[model samples]
Target: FMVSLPRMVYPQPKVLTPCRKDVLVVTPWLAPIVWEGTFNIDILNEQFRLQNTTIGLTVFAIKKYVAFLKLFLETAEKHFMVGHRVHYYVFTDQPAAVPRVTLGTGRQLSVLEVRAYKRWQDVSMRRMEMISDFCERRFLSEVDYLVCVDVDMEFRDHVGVEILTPLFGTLHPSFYGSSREAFTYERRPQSQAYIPKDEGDFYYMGAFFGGSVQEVQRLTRACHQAMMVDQANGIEAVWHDESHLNKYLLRHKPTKVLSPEYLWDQQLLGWPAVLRKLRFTAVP
Candidate 1:
């Protein structure tokens, strides 16, 4: 794994203000929008300085398919080429021979090696452990936002990245329902084993998810701790990582909901218009 820039125990001036106001604020209308809509230049600059985030891609190497990896890397290049930097952190038992994904623009891909526990049942457990380790050991104090993606999804447009930008410490795409009936957990109680009592809402879609480094760190650590607790009690959850994630988010709802456009899995939605345009390729 590559190292992030040196940390500043105390916030520095540049950290507070990434660029001069005049540099980022194009016009009077844009100034107000920038202040209200996104982080202020100082805050943005500071965030950029301290937490320079990139798209994080994690995979189950043993179960992973080659076609999915190729398509994912291709779509990743499209997104990362446009100014925003993206880092693909592939956690696998076997190291990938091709370590770099080049999309011109001087952007470089960093591939990290990690071991996976054997057995399909243990896949979720190993992923959970890897995420915790990556955040704490590699990215806890660095990166601004981290996204965990399976090796099988692709972006339909630039909106895929923008949809998640507004939400910090929040969930994306408005709680997973295109219709009213789709929103209720009562529809499938078995899969939705642990629904929140009065404040119950299901928002666990681990295949493609992202949030602030701080929030994700909290979530990863919390989920890891929860898994240990569940294990000690001799209660093995059916969904493992997804179940533990659902439990954590139920107690601590995401700060915001990312637009559904951020992530669209073909397995779930089939070939929608947005997906068709992207020409997303997935293994059957």
Candidate 2:
């Protein structure tokens, strides 16, 4: 009898690719979004199931902004409806009267208690942990898609799930701002922020983006982990989460690249073509 030798096998990356198709996410990161642009209600109704969408509105509880918070709640309720069940994940040091500020959509609203960081500049980096903890603890188990939006954003039109429907593995569109100067790794020897010479067009508007839960989760987790490493190495870079996100995306190209039209800031660049077609004016 001859003994047979076992052949060696290499393990490939077990990448958990997202469904890519048939999933929509709506993310509101730093602040709530205001809908001031021209919207096509017909298009919105035809394209997506608004009721199934999830909006993650992340905010820091600054006591001085109690009025702002109230207005935020009011504004969100004014825009969002039962069709889109909104989940205001209040990540703050102190809990507000979550019950008092109601959307009237019979949608779910909750709060996640966490300590606050002192510096405003620290917001970008700290949000990663806030979002990660929230997803792991709550949103992941229930939602299919997620959108991370900023506090000062306002959607001018009926830009719903369908608008961001095509996102796959790590997809983000060009933001509204861009510098004449190209990005370079040499800029920060110790930091992960790297933009190749070939990189050009659009800015990371920090508003109006969404994707499958898994992809966003992976990106967020990777970003969070990178921040941890950078922090440990005693390298406190600028732009916090935005810098890290730009660096990560630049390094690991996202599955889809959105057009700058998705997030159009009047101050950054006059207005998007689509918005112009609708004859929309800038919000003050």
Candidate 3:
């Protein structure tokens, strides 16, 4: 069910000044970019609370990646969906090894045991298939929205309900400043992930993405099917699951666009003045 936002009245800026004049806060598609100054958390929280939103966070931690769950869950208890109902679905090969991280009120964690892949590439690519498979059996009835993210990450600042939307994608920290032509989208026409040189809205990072249960199911299913087609033709995308994700979002635009604030790598690219808040970042 889509929650209709109540109409908000804003105080007008002075004759010489305009609201949000310093940045590109929203995309051309009318989706909010989720920058610090772009929204009011109080208002967003109230709206979502009225709807009784329940958010489900899904993450894959196979083998060595399980080490990241401790900090990830700790910070998530402090930041992610703080007030609303939340369910953390931790997918791992070794369920017993998952940390016994405590949870806040109205939040819970579920350990889902699964087979571990041998190759690192297989571990990365099969995430789409696994997520899609679960959406049908469990996620469809468990939560209102599903947020999928990489395991090797931590919450630095608040990652609250303000980012919730029907569908959304985060801007890749490495490609936000580059032009569409310079984007590293798959160029080979033989692959399903291919994007023409002249086409694209924004470069989305596969590390973080989410939507309503239906839309998320749609996205993962599409990406998985595309990968199967590529496998049949003996063609692999340059960035594996990420490449197909970009292709899908390009064809089916997202409901909201998250700023680089949602996905950043402090070690690789230090914070820039343009970013007001570094909400989530890579663990170093």
Q: Which candidate has the top score in lDDT?
A: 3
For all predicted structures, in order, the TM-scores are 0.63, 0.64, 0.92
Pick the winner on lDDT between candidates 1 and 3. 3
* lDDT tens digits by residue: candidate 1, 1-284: 43454554544446565433422222222211111123323334444434444544445544445446666676667753245455556665556554345564534555556554465444556667667755465665444466766675665455223323422222223354433334333222343234434544445465655566666767777777766666566555665666666666666656444323444445655644322232222333
TM-score of 1: 0.63
Mark the regions of model 1 whose C-alpha exceeds 4 Å error after superposition.
1-57, 64-67, 97-100, 119-122, 159-175, 178-193, 196-198, 266-284
Q: 142-239, model 3: which lDDT tens digit per residue?
A: 89999999989999899988778888899999999999998889999999999999999888999999999889889999999998898879888888
**Poorest lDDT segment (10 consecutive residues) of candidate 3:** 11-20
lDDT of 2 by residue, 1-284 (tens): 32333343444434484222222222222121222232334445434453355655455544543334555555556554336655666655557543366567545557766666676535556667766645564667666566665544444433344334423222222322335253322246576554544563323433444456666776677778777777777776565666667666555544444434444446645644333322111233
Clashes of each: 14, 22, 0
Candidate 1, run of 10 with poorest lDDT: 27-36
